[PDB]
PDB file of C-alpha atoms in Angstrom:
ATOM      1  CA  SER A   2     104.479 110.244 107.306  1.00 52.56           C
ATOM      2  CA  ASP A   3     105.445 106.799 106.913  1.00 52.10           C
ATOM      3  CA  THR A   4     105.081 105.885 110.525  1.00 54.75           C
ATOM      4  CA  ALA A   5     101.838 104.088 109.536  1.00 53.27           C
ATOM      5  CA  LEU A   6     103.431 102.218 106.545  1.00 53.97           C
ATOM      6  CA  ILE A   7     106.080 100.536 108.855  1.00 50.25           C
ATOM      7  CA  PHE A   8     103.882  99.110 111.631  1.00 51.66           C
ATOM      8  CA  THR A   9     101.339  97.997 108.574  1.00 54.00           C
ATOM      9  CA  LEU A  10     104.578  96.554 107.263  1.00 50.17           C
ATOM     10  CA  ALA A  11     105.928  95.321 110.640  1.00 56.00           C
ATOM     11  CA  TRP A  12     102.187  93.610 111.584  1.00 59.50           C
ATOM     12  CA  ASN A  13     102.479  92.258 108.405  1.00 59.52           C
ATOM     13  CA  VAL A  14     106.404  91.285 107.965  1.00 61.95           C
ATOM     14  CA  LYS A  15     107.162  90.714 111.806  1.00 60.43           C
ATOM     15  CA  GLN A  16     110.767  91.423 111.209  1.00 59.87           C
ATOM     16  CA  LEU A  17     112.357  92.825 107.811  1.00 59.24           C
ATOM     17  CA  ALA A  18     116.430  94.857 107.567  1.00 56.91           C
ATOM     18  CA  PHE A  19     117.566  96.372 104.393  1.00 56.93           C
ATOM     19  CA  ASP A  20     119.955  98.878 103.729  1.00 53.29           C
ATOM     20  CA  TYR A  21     119.555 100.638 100.277  1.00 50.70           C
ATOM     21  CA  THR A  22     122.194 103.743 100.492  1.00 51.80           C
ATOM     22  CA  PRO A  23     123.997 103.250  96.875  1.00 50.97           C
ATOM     23  CA  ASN A  24     127.550 102.233  97.215  1.00 52.09           C
ATOM     24  CA  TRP A  25     129.210 103.559  93.968  1.00 50.68           C
ATOM     25  CA  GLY A  26     132.118 101.904  92.791  1.00 53.49           C
ATOM     26  CA  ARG A  27     134.284 103.609  90.632  1.00 49.69           C
ATOM     27  CA  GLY A  28     136.267 102.086  87.371  1.00 48.47           C
ATOM     28  CA  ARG A  29     139.398 103.346  84.878  1.00 49.33           C
ATOM     29  CA  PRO A  30     139.222 106.189  84.525  1.00 48.45           C
ATOM     30  CA  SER A  31     138.371 106.840  88.181  1.00 46.48           C
ATOM     31  CA  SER A  32     136.037 109.530  86.280  1.00 47.59           C
ATOM     32  CA  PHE A  33     134.202 106.554  85.360  1.00 44.94           C
ATOM     33  CA  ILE A  34     131.486 105.071  87.539  1.00 44.35           C
ATOM     34  CA  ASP A  35     131.067 101.785  86.701  1.00 44.50           C
ATOM     35  CA  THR A  36     129.003  99.570  89.224  1.00 48.34           C
ATOM     36  CA  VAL A  37     126.877 100.304  92.290  1.00 49.43           C
ATOM     37  CA  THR A  38     126.158  98.023  95.533  1.00 47.41           C
ATOM     38  CA  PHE A  39     123.576  97.871  98.005  1.00 50.08           C
ATOM     39  CA  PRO A  40     124.354  96.336 101.475  1.00 50.85           C
ATOM     40  CA  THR A  41     120.955  94.644 102.358  1.00 50.17           C
ATOM     41  CA  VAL A  42     118.770  93.953  99.716  1.00 52.55           C
ATOM     42  CA  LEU A  43     115.599  92.211 100.103  1.00 51.67           C
ATOM     43  CA  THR A  44     115.691  88.437  99.006  1.00 50.31           C
ATOM     44  CA  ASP A  45     112.196  87.301  99.060  1.00 48.14           C
ATOM     45  CA  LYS A  46     111.937  87.643  94.848  1.00 48.50           C
ATOM     46  CA  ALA A  47     113.753  87.190  92.254  1.00 50.34           C
ATOM     47  CA  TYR A  48     114.376  91.282  92.021  1.00 49.25           C
ATOM     48  CA  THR A  49     116.307  92.599  88.941  1.00 49.79           C
ATOM     49  CA  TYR A  50     117.126  96.174  87.653  1.00 49.31           C
ATOM     50  CA  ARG A  51     116.739  98.299  84.940  1.00 48.04           C
ATOM     51  CA  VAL A  52     119.718 101.139  84.375  1.00 49.77           C
ATOM     52  CA  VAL A  53     118.275 104.807  83.032  1.00 48.91           C
ATOM     53  CA  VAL A  54     121.268 106.968  82.367  1.00 49.84           C
ATOM     54  CA  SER A  55     120.678 110.444  80.638  1.00 44.92           C
ATOM     55  CA  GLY A  56     117.375 109.637  79.812  1.00 45.18           C
ATOM     56  CA  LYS A  57     118.682 106.554  77.478  1.00 45.24           C
ATOM     57  CA  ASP A  58     116.991 102.882  79.043  1.00 44.70           C
ATOM     58  CA  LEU A  59     119.998 101.055  78.567  1.00 43.68           C
ATOM     59  CA  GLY A  60     117.302  97.873  80.021  1.00 44.51           C
ATOM     60  CA  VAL A  61     117.466  94.839  82.361  1.00 43.98           C
ATOM     61  CA  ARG A  62     119.865  91.981  82.536  1.00 49.79           C
ATOM     62  CA  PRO A  63     120.452  89.186  84.527  1.00 47.79           C
ATOM     63  CA  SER A  64     120.939  90.231  88.402  1.00 47.65           C
ATOM     64  CA  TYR A  65     124.146  89.057  90.309  1.00 48.07           C
ATOM     65  CA  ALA A  66     123.940  86.861  93.403  1.00 49.18           C
ATOM     66  CA  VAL A  67     122.543  88.198  96.478  1.00 52.30           C
ATOM     67  CA  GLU A  68     125.945  87.175  98.366  1.00 51.08           C
ATOM     68  CA  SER A  69     126.205  85.948 101.849  1.00 52.55           C
ATOM     69  CA  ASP A  70     126.539  89.715 103.739  1.00 54.63           C
ATOM     70  CA  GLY A  71     123.240  90.731 101.654  1.00 54.33           C
ATOM     71  CA  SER A  72     124.595  92.904  99.472  1.00 52.50           C
ATOM     72  CA  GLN A  73     123.943  93.069  96.249  1.00 54.20           C
ATOM     73  CA  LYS A  74     126.032  94.309  93.274  1.00 55.05           C
ATOM     74  CA  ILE A  75     124.611  96.027  90.055  1.00 53.86           C
ATOM     75  CA  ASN A  76     127.849  95.542  87.226  1.00 54.67           C
ATOM     76  CA  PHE A  77     126.574  99.086  84.718  1.00 51.51           C
ATOM     77  CA  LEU A  78     129.157  97.057  82.315  1.00 52.94           C
ATOM     78  CA  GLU A  79     127.154  94.505  81.787  1.00 52.68           C
ATOM     79  CA  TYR A  80     124.233  97.540  80.685  1.00 50.50           C
ATOM     80  CA  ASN A  81     126.340  99.860  78.957  1.00 51.23           C
ATOM     81  CA  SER A  82     127.855  97.869  76.128  1.00 51.47           C
ATOM     82  CA  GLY A  83     130.898  97.114  78.310  1.00 51.89           C
ATOM     83  CA  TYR A  84     131.534 100.854  79.600  1.00 51.53           C
ATOM     84  CA  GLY A  85     131.372 102.225  82.829  1.00 51.89           C
ATOM     85  CA  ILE A  86     129.417 105.758  83.231  1.00 49.38           C
ATOM     86  CA  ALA A  87     131.161 109.293  82.915  1.00 50.20           C
ATOM     87  CA  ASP A  88     130.304 110.629  86.678  1.00 51.72           C
ATOM     88  CA  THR A  89     128.651 113.481  84.460  1.00 50.80           C
ATOM     89  CA  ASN A  90     125.968 111.699  83.235  1.00 51.03           C
ATOM     90  CA  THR A  91     122.988 111.509  85.665  1.00 49.95           C
ATOM     91  CA  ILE A  92     122.066 107.371  86.250  1.00 49.04           C
ATOM     92  CA  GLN A  93     119.069 106.657  87.410  1.00 48.88           C
ATOM     93  CA  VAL A  94     118.723 102.807  89.017  1.00 50.81           C
ATOM     94  CA  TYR A  95     114.881 100.832  89.318  1.00 46.93           C
ATOM     95  CA  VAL A  96     114.722  97.312  90.960  1.00 45.22           C
ATOM     96  CA  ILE A  97     111.523  95.505  89.238  1.00 46.82           C
ATOM     97  CA  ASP A  98     109.337  93.341  91.097  1.00 46.05           C
ATOM     98  CA  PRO A  99     108.637  90.126  88.940  1.00 46.95           C
ATOM     99  CA  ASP A 100     105.118  89.320  90.228  1.00 49.50           C
ATOM    100  CA  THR A 101     103.804  93.240  88.545  1.00 53.87           C
ATOM    101  CA  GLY A 102     106.643  94.667  86.189  1.00 55.49           C
ATOM    102  CA  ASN A 103     107.197  97.542  88.127  1.00 55.92           C
ATOM    103  CA  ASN A 104     109.902  99.367  88.477  1.00 53.27           C
ATOM    104  CA  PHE A 105     110.898 101.709  91.881  1.00 57.51           C
ATOM    105  CA  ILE A 106     114.304 104.198  92.042  1.00 59.09           C
ATOM    106  CA  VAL A 107     116.819 103.024  93.772  1.00 58.73           C
ATOM    107  CA  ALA A 108     119.690 104.802  93.545  1.00 60.54           C
ATOM    108  CA  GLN A 109     119.954 107.903  91.402  1.00 55.95           C
ATOM    109  CA  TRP A 110     123.504 109.127  90.536  1.00 56.45           C
ATOM    110  CA  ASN A 111     123.511 113.260  89.567  1.00 59.09           C
TER     111      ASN A 111
ATOM    112  CA  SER B   2     101.337  92.756  98.105  1.00 61.74           C
ATOM    113  CA  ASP B   3     103.525  94.928  99.780  1.00 61.05           C
ATOM    114  CA  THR B   4     106.199  94.749  97.655  1.00 61.49           C
ATOM    115  CA  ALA B   5     105.602  98.666  96.828  1.00 60.63           C
ATOM    116  CA  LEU B   6     105.201  99.803 100.504  1.00 61.32           C
ATOM    117  CA  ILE B   7     108.744  98.396 101.013  1.00 60.00           C
ATOM    118  CA  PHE B   8     110.427  99.754  98.032  1.00 57.97           C
ATOM    119  CA  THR B   9     108.488 103.387  98.713  1.00 56.05           C
ATOM    120  CA  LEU B  10     110.575 103.374 102.537  1.00 54.93           C
ATOM    121  CA  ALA B  11     113.351 102.423 101.247  1.00 55.77           C
ATOM    122  CA  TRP B  12     113.872 105.199  98.288  1.00 56.95           C
ATOM    123  CA  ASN B  13     112.665 107.478 101.632  1.00 56.65           C
ATOM    124  CA  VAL B  14     115.078 105.919 104.837  1.00 58.02           C
ATOM    125  CA  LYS B  15     117.571 103.702 102.428  1.00 58.19           C
ATOM    126  CA  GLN B  16     118.433 101.741 105.825  1.00 57.65           C
ATOM    127  CA  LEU B  17     115.993 100.382 108.227  1.00 55.78           C
ATOM    128  CA  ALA B  18     115.829  96.956 110.337  1.00 57.01           C
ATOM    129  CA  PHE B  19     113.446  96.461 112.459  1.00 53.77           C
ATOM    130  CA  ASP B  20     112.036  92.885 114.552  1.00 54.74           C
ATOM    131  CA  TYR B  21     108.242  93.567 116.306  1.00 55.21           C
ATOM    132  CA  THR B  22     108.266  89.302 116.906  1.00 56.04           C
ATOM    133  CA  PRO B  23     106.905  90.017 120.202  1.00 58.75           C
ATOM    134  CA  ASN B  24     108.814  87.459 123.313  1.00 54.18           C
ATOM    135  CA  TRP B  25     105.724  87.364 126.057  1.00 53.30           C
ATOM    136  CA  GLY B  26     107.088  86.766 129.231  1.00 49.30           C
ATOM    137  CA  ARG B  27     105.183  84.649 132.029  1.00 49.80           C
ATOM    138  CA  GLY B  28     105.199  85.900 135.258  1.00 52.49           C
ATOM    139  CA  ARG B  29     104.130  84.547 138.120  1.00 52.99           C
ATOM    140  CA  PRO B  30     101.546  81.685 138.806  1.00 52.37           C
ATOM    141  CA  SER B  31     103.853  80.318 135.077  1.00 55.44           C
ATOM    142  CA  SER B  32     100.087  80.721 133.488  1.00 56.63           C
ATOM    143  CA  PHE B  33     100.274  84.707 133.500  1.00 56.04           C
ATOM    144  CA  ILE B  34     101.434  86.774 130.891  1.00 55.08           C
ATOM    145  CA  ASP B  35     103.314  89.780 132.685  1.00 52.47           C
ATOM    146  CA  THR B  36     105.636  91.354 129.655  1.00 54.18           C
ATOM    147  CA  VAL B  37     105.819  91.959 125.140  1.00 50.43           C
ATOM    148  CA  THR B  38     109.242  92.520 124.341  1.00 51.95           C
ATOM    149  CA  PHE B  39     110.135  93.666 120.671  1.00 50.73           C
ATOM    150  CA  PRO B  40     113.639  92.852 119.999  1.00 47.93           C
ATOM    151  CA  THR B  41     114.617  95.842 117.526  1.00 46.82           C
ATOM    152  CA  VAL B  42     112.285  98.826 117.387  1.00 43.41           C
ATOM    153  CA  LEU B  43     111.640 102.413 115.671  1.00 41.39           C
ATOM    154  CA  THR B  44     113.442 104.792 117.841  1.00 42.98           C
ATOM    155  CA  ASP B  45     112.650 107.999 115.315  1.00 41.77           C
ATOM    156  CA  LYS B  46     109.728 109.073 117.869  1.00 43.22           C
ATOM    157  CA  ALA B  47     108.947 108.795 121.521  1.00 46.84           C
ATOM    158  CA  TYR B  48     106.126 105.990 120.768  1.00 46.94           C
ATOM    159  CA  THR B  49     104.061 105.303 123.354  1.00 43.12           C
ATOM    160  CA  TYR B  50     101.695 100.952 124.224  1.00 42.02           C
ATOM    161  CA  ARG B  51      98.481 101.269 124.841  1.00 40.67           C
ATOM    162  CA  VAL B  52      97.344  97.335 126.567  1.00 35.39           C
ATOM    163  CA  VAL B  53      93.227  96.297 125.706  1.00 34.78           C
ATOM    164  CA  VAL B  54      92.842  92.981 127.436  1.00 32.63           C
ATOM    165  CA  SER B  55      89.821  90.606 126.912  1.00 34.45           C
ATOM    166  CA  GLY B  56      88.001  93.611 125.160  1.00 37.06           C
ATOM    167  CA  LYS B  57      89.183  96.559 128.058  1.00 34.66           C
ATOM    168  CA  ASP B  58      90.987  99.079 127.452  1.00 33.66           C
ATOM    169  CA  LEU B  59      93.536  99.985 130.293  1.00 32.78           C
ATOM    170  CA  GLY B  60      94.898 102.717 128.902  1.00 32.72           C
ATOM    171  CA  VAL B  61      98.361 103.987 128.195  1.00 32.86           C
ATOM    172  CA  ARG B  62     101.335 104.724 130.235  1.00 33.45           C
ATOM    173  CA  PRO B  63     104.957 105.944 130.127  1.00 34.36           C
ATOM    174  CA  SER B  64     106.937 103.822 128.008  1.00 35.09           C
ATOM    175  CA  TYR B  65     110.377 101.450 128.833  1.00 33.90           C
ATOM    176  CA  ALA B  66     114.047 102.723 127.772  1.00 34.68           C
ATOM    177  CA  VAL B  67     114.654 101.682 123.902  1.00 33.53           C
ATOM    178  CA  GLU B  68     118.002  99.463 125.818  1.00 32.97           C
ATOM    179  CA  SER B  69     121.418  99.382 123.957  1.00 32.30           C
ATOM    180  CA  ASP B  70     120.249  95.683 121.920  1.00 33.81           C
ATOM    181  CA  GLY B  71     117.344  97.972 120.302  1.00 32.41           C
ATOM    182  CA  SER B  72     115.061  95.694 122.179  1.00 31.65           C
ATOM    183  CA  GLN B  73     111.714  97.866 123.983  1.00 31.28           C
ATOM    184  CA  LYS B  74     109.555  95.937 126.783  1.00 32.71           C
ATOM    185  CA  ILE B  75     105.855  96.432 128.058  1.00 33.69           C
ATOM    186  CA  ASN B  76     105.049  95.296 131.419  1.00 31.94           C
ATOM    187  CA  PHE B  77     101.692  94.585 131.707  1.00 29.05           C
ATOM    188  CA  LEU B  78     101.784  95.119 135.253  1.00 28.72           C
ATOM    189  CA  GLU B  79     102.246  98.612 135.398  1.00 33.03           C
ATOM    190  CA  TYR B  80      98.328  98.716 132.796  1.00 35.30           C
ATOM    191  CA  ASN B  81      96.606  95.843 134.440  1.00 33.33           C
ATOM    192  CA  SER B  82      96.326  97.249 138.655  1.00 34.02           C
ATOM    193  CA  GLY B  83     100.092  95.641 139.170  1.00 33.18           C
ATOM    194  CA  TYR B  84      98.809  92.282 137.746  1.00 34.93           C
ATOM    195  CA  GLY B  85     100.170  89.730 135.255  1.00 38.04           C
ATOM    196  CA  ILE B  86      97.120  88.028 132.453  1.00 40.43           C
ATOM    197  CA  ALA B  87      95.641  84.857 132.843  1.00 41.54           C
ATOM    198  CA  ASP B  88      97.014  83.258 129.377  1.00 39.93           C
ATOM    199  CA  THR B  89      93.882  82.728 128.858  1.00 37.59           C
ATOM    200  CA  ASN B  90      92.613  85.898 127.962  1.00 42.45           C
ATOM    201  CA  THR B  91      93.415  87.655 124.917  1.00 40.74           C
ATOM    202  CA  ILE B  92      95.747  90.994 124.799  1.00 38.40           C
ATOM    203  CA  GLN B  93      96.013  93.304 122.239  1.00 40.56           C
ATOM    204  CA  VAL B  94      99.129  96.102 121.891  1.00 39.31           C
ATOM    205  CA  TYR B  95      98.840  98.860 120.441  1.00 38.14           C
ATOM    206  CA  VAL B  96     101.359 100.980 119.566  1.00 35.46           C
ATOM    207  CA  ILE B  97     100.476 104.951 119.532  1.00 36.63           C
ATOM    208  CA  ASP B  98     102.330 107.522 116.846  1.00 37.42           C
ATOM    209  CA  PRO B  99     103.011 110.595 118.850  1.00 41.68           C
ATOM    210  CA  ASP B 100     102.602 112.805 116.003  1.00 44.47           C
ATOM    211  CA  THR B 101      98.622 112.137 115.246  1.00 46.16           C
ATOM    212  CA  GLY B 102      97.487 109.417 118.261  1.00 45.93           C
ATOM    213  CA  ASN B 103      96.832 106.430 115.294  1.00 46.07           C
ATOM    214  CA  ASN B 104      96.990 103.016 117.302  1.00 44.59           C
ATOM    215  CA  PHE B 105      98.667 100.395 115.421  1.00 41.95           C
ATOM    216  CA  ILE B 106      98.579  96.481 116.524  1.00 45.17           C
ATOM    217  CA  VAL B 107     102.305  94.828 116.899  1.00 45.54           C
ATOM    218  CA  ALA B 108     101.423  92.233 119.684  1.00 47.59           C
ATOM    219  CA  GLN B 109      98.107  89.838 120.028  1.00 51.27           C
ATOM    220  CA  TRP B 110      97.894  86.842 122.128  1.00 51.15           C
ATOM    221  CA  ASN B 111      95.230  84.304 121.854  1.00 53.23           C
TER     222      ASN B 111
END
């Protein structure tokens, strides 16, 4: 149960709103996935993202800006040598905590 | 650090928004605190609240409804034999998880 975590967090931060429901964007051809966008990301740190495709770690790249609507986009073309990812591949996206280097899964395409 | 907790929670619930910044309401006289309201409370369970005044446990009472704007109010008159609380007293409000009976501090007046 995550109830204890939520209230512990609430007491500490008082207010928080996030939405990491992955919005996958298709490129060209349409069978290719080229981006993922999170509606409302955390903004307390300069988070970065690592991408893994079919078991292969593509590494980290500089983050795009958190936009006015609070969303943040990850462009896979920047990680995959300029190409989108065939939707038959598995894709894992990890957010990275700059303070520790810890990696946390935030999106998974299967 | 609560970064690990937030992303762990994010991966599990995907989206969450809460605001437990206490909005203390004054009654009559104005030096008396009669309520506390939370702008955006959790709604996944039938949470209840326990109130403690100057070290004295006043117990639990049925919760008021979570309103359309997502807020929830705790009326201390319902807990303190019909009276508000002199603002010189310390007040602690705990939310209770119906699944475990666990008590988590959500508001403290000092």
